[PDB]
């Protein structure tokens, strides 16, 4: 019976591979050869945000493009006003080690997680005027790598126990559990409609999950190393992935296979974060060489390099309006580029 | 100049937050951070309990020696895989690796673990303090002459006690030989490929010893002295 199961699984994998190979009728490089070059996309450090004491590890833009929330291993969440570089909130953390931060789309809550295995949701609209730990959701048996807000009540988290959980913040229980990954779920990205999302783990795999159904609809295994970053294409029909292999990869959900690989001989380090521009034609990737790269999504050509960092770039995020980008590095500096 | 009243008030609030941040900076740079790693059989729990008598994750333990504040961070609930969450633990003053010297059956896995810590990309700079716990159990096993180290480790048959090493008083030659060979087993790996950016400080400790904190203090003093000798162009 067990041997029959293994052979059937191998046959199903062969069938899926055959279908994927059949679907590949044309390649994007050939399709977009005539598209005009993007040119030299050069960026400048408009603002430098200072005040953190240790390595910045997480960042997240709000619905508005004026507020950032950054997390530091010293044990602080600092909310900065990008337009004026003002620390609106300075929330201490019980656990010094912080690896993920989130900002609710409405802006009424901020999440914080890490090795403590507890997701702390803090309320900034308190009548008392002091930020408080509104909720401390526990249950995960591994460190939290990412957390994103679907709404004020529901928050999705990914832990180091090779699982993800949907938490009703008020009730504080795992409403739905997503399991199947072979390694730590480093990266999470929610779709624009929030009905679907993508999770990339350390087993060189990414999975497409539906929040309601609770199943991994699609699996992608294009990378040769651990996946440390995943982001959603703006349309919602593709996602970019950055892994330890030093190469970014585009995977489209409809065709169910990779659509481009971005790699250069000059880079041999891993990728920390990945994001897209509003149109999706500029893939921004942070690298361990203290440099960030702006590739052309549709043609795979390095459009620019942002080298204004002194340590590992750990966080990367493009505004909702797309006017600027924000990079957080282990040098304790959060810098805005445009 | 162009700023309005509420903008100036927000700026003042930002200055207050920056002042609080500097206040926290003083303590943060004053505090010394340590990463307590050890096997389940290794008596890390015993040392942790000793310190504070002077699905949770990281367990902290703060102690003070000679007015120096030491935070010690223990990783209990993290998954078996270690390659990823070691990154957050760089920039630590020392990695206190606790190894069970009593059980020779699992000492090979302990050596492999120490090698993994030593040759990690992110922990190349940081120093490791090696505490070989349960020295009393080591002596009992060696002098009961029932468990032979040669069975697990072949080379022990050829190894000879180093004359440079100083034997402890009231210690049989067999216990000295066994303990120093187990030390040399780790020291050989530590010295090779280290390149001098990180150093190991093996120490022989027992279960309920009271000198663990002072040994850690001395090791941290040495590590900081070397760090300064490099950062001040003295080497």
């Amino acid at each position, epitope marked *: 019976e067990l041997d029959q199961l293994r052979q059937e699984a191998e046959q199903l994998k062969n069938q899926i591979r055959d279908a994927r190979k059949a679907c590949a009728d044309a390649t994007l490089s050939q399709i977009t050869n005539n598209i005009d070059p993007v040119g030299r996309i050069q960026m400048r450090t408009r603002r430098t945000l200072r005040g953190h004491l240790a390595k910045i590890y997480a960042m997240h833009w709000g619905t508005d493009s*004026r*507020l950032l929330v950054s997390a530091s291993q010293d044990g602080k969440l600092i909310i900065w*006003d990008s337009y004026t570089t*003002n620390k*609106v*909130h300075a929330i201490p953390l019980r656990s010094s080690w912080v690896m993920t931060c989130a900002y609710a789309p409405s*802006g009424n809550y901020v999440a914080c997680g890490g090795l403590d295995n507890i997701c702390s949701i803090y309320n900034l*609209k308190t*009548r*008392e*005027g*002091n930020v408080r730990v509104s909720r401390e959701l526990a249950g995960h048996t591994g460190y939290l790598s990412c957390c994103r807000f679907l709404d004020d009540n529901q928050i999705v988290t990914s832990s180091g126990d090779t699982t993800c959980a949907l938490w009703d913040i008020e009730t504080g229980q795992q409403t739905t559990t997503f399991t199947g990954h072979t390694g730590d779920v480093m990266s999470l990205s929610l779709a624009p409609d929030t009905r679907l999302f993508v999770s990339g783990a350390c087993d060189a795999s990414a999975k497409l999950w539906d929040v309601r159904e609770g199943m991994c609809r699609q699996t992608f295994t294009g990378h040769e190393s651990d996946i440390n970053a995943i982001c959603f294409f703006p349309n919602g029909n593709a996602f970019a992935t950055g892994s330890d292999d030093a190469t970014c990869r585009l995977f489209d959900l409809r065709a169910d296979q990779e659509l481009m690989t971005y790699s250069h001989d000059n880079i041999i380090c891993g990728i920390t974060s990945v994001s897209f521009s509003k149109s999706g034609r500029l893939l921004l990737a942070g690298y361990d060489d203290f440099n960030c790269n702006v590739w052309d999504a549709l043609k795979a050509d390095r459009a620019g390099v942002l080298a204004g960092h002194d340590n590992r770039v750990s966080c990367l995020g493009v505004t909702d309006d797309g006017m600027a980008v924000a990079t957080g590095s282990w040098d304790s500096f959060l810098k805005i580029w445009n | 100049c*162009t700023l*309005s*009243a*509420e*903008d*100036k*008030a*927000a700026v*003042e*609030r930002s*200055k*207050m937050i920056e002042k609080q941040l500097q206040k926290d900076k003083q303590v943060y740079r004053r505090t010394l951070r340590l990463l307590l790693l050890g096997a389940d059989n290794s008596g890390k729990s015993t040392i942790v309990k000793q310190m504070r008598i002077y699905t949770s994750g990281i367990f902290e333990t703060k102690f003070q020696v000679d007015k120096v504040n030491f935070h010690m961070f223990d990783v209990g609930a993290q998954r078996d895989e270690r390659r990823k969450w070691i990154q957050c633990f760089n920039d630590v003053t020392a990695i206190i690796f606790v190894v069970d010297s009593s059980d020779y059956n699992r000492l090979q896995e302990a050596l492999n673990d120490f090698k993994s810590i030593w040759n990690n990309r992110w922990l190349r700079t940081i120093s490791v303090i090696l505490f070989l716990n349960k020295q009393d159990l080591l002596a009992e096993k060696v002098l009961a002459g029932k468990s032979k180290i040669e069975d697990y480790f072949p080379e022990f048959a050829r190894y000879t006690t180093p004359e440079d090493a100083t034997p402890e008083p009231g210690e049989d030659p067999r216990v000295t030989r066994a303990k120093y060979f187990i030390r040399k087993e780790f020291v050989d790996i530590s010295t090779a490929s280290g390149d001098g950016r990180h150093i190991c400080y093996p120490h022989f400790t027992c279960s309920v010893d009271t000198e663990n904190a002072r040994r850690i203090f001395n090791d941290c003093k040495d590590i900081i002295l070397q760090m300064n000798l490099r950062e001040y162009n003295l080497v």
Partner: single-chain antibody
Amino acid sequence: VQLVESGGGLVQPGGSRKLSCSASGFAFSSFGMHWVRQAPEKGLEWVAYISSGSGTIYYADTVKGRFTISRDDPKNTLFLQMTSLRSEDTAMYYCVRSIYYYGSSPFDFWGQGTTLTVSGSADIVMTQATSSVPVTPGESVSISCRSSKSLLHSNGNTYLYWFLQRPGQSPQLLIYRMSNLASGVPDRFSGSGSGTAFTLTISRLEAEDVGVYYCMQHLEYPLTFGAGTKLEL
């Protein structure tokens, strides 16, 4: 959140009395404090302001110098030492709290008020021509005000605050910047404007709406209010 005030009684001209203001239920240190006087059968006026941490302290022109403001954070209390009392100073003094950060709601909580019975320049002038605007329940009401100087700033914010003081009750905040409804305010209330003339509209009138509506500016710290329009049932 409750701010209770005490230390106001019968005083004669030239006396010196201290008002005390005790807060409970919120971070007193983080918030800034303001003193607002309501003279009997008169409008609102701003007395003094102390920032969080005492890094910025301001006083009104009328009481410039004579009155002092000081806060004792460890005891969670605020003081006001009066000097050279005059017959014009008789009024009910309230404590207001204001935290200033992006997306804040300044002048949010007001204190009950201590009665005191004794015995201008380049300051925006706020005018509310309609002294009385009688309306019936269920009908929409409108209140119009103006400013000599434009209340809009390069940052892009209109610094106009709409408050309502009900019969025998302390003032409350309705709109903090010309468009935004304060916490706990019915959605009926709404505010609009252009920079020189502003309107506050109540969609349907109820029995807890009646009162005197005041408009205040915050472009310059000599914060000014209006005569206030009274809505009758």
